[PDB]
Write a protein that binds this DNA or RNA. Structure first.
Length: 150
RNA sequence: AAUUGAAGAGUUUGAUCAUGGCUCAGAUUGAACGCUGGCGGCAGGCCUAACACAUGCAAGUCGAACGGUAACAGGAAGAAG
């Protein structure tokens, strides 16, 4: 019931004294399938150590999302660095139809059938960060009615 | 009951993030070309030279408008084997 999946692995470099030194970065997202989404970055010298650090950071640093029946509630826009992201609840608008690196976080998030369209930059490290910010500041009808009295 | 509706990716760098262009994945067509080709249904078929046109048809009808008889088939009368 953990439901982990990796989005992006890259080879970064460092350029020391004698030549270059190549390191690998993972970027994974875990989530239970009912709210509870996390992402982790993690970087290491080989690929399986990188993904393992990424999963291990992603299992902690996990955020609650106030889902609807199987989906979002109201249309929400989350931004991070250069990466602007729209989402629309699509009240059984079948299938998760999101961009790459947004399909994954929305998939393990437990949502099933939203409509997305990322704008701006679509770097995978910042398009999540713009989905969680997004799903984090999406509030439910029992939270809005809690705030404003009824 | 009559709008249930939105996906990205590759490429600037030793690597990064951003900006930014180029390019790809889709659908479409009065299409052409290449390879191949069994049947049917429904549609479509000179986008260019509003260039030049052989030949055949594409606008005739009415005698219940009229003088009339060129034919065709009868009618009447005459003459002949």
């Amino acid at each position: 019931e953990l439901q982990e999946k990796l989005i992006a692995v890259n080879r970064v470099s460092k350029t020391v004294k004698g030549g270059r030194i190549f390191s690998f970065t993972a970027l994974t997202v875990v989530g239970d399938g009912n709210g509870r989404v996390g992402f982790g970055y993690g970087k290491a010298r080989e690929v399986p150590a990188a993904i393992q650090k990424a999963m291990e950071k992603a299992r902690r640093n996990m955020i609650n999302v106030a889902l609807n029946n199987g989906t979002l509630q109201h249309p929400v826009k989350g931004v991070h660095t250069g990466s602007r992201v729209f989402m629309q609840p699509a009240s059984e608008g079948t299938g998760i139809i999101a961009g790459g690196a947004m399909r994954a976080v929305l998939e393990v998030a437990g949502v099933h059938n939203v409509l997305a369209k990322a704008y701006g930059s679509t770097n995978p490290i910042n398009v999540v960060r713009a989905t969680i910010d997004g799903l984090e500041n999406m509030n439910s009808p029992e939270m809005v009615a809690a705030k404003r009295g009824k």
